[PDB]
Structure 1
């Protein structure tokens, strides 16, 4: 992977407000917000619209 070419790959946790589920997945646009899950290995946080677990078609 080349350096100083791509944006950051840094990890980040996604959480939907309704279902309140948490999972790690690397992405851009951190926003810099603390997490509860795995607080030791601290990562950013992102608030999200209904996920598959929430969305009625999926579940």
Structure 2
């Protein structure tokens, strides 16, 4: 890492307040950061997801 050209890449916190998953890591962001969706709140990881015949039988 050359002194003079790289940014301020400091350790910050990633909070998924939806499921309060509080993860620590680096960023050039400028310490608590807001995130809405994530591997612990997104459907496909979590595995939970939100026909002409059955349709026609109800009627």
TM-score clears 0.5 = yes
Q: Which runs of 5+ in 2 are unaligned?
A: 47-59
Q: CA RMSD in A?
A: 0.9
Q: Computing the radius of gyration over CA atoms, which structure comes out larger, 1 or 2? A: 2
Higher relative contact order, chain-length normalized (CA < 8 Å, sep 6+): 1
Counterpart for residue 22 of structure 1: 22
State the shift of 1:49 in Å.
1.8
Quick check: which one's strand share is greater?
2
Q: How many residues align?
A: 46
Q: Which runs of 5+ in 1 are unaligned?
A: 31-43
Structure 1 length-normalised TM: 0.70
Structure 2 length-normalised TM: 0.70
> CA-to-partner distance for each residue in 1:4-58, whole Å, 9 max, x for gaps?
201111100000120111111100112xxxxxxxxxxxxx110112111000111
Quick check: which one's helix share is greater?
2
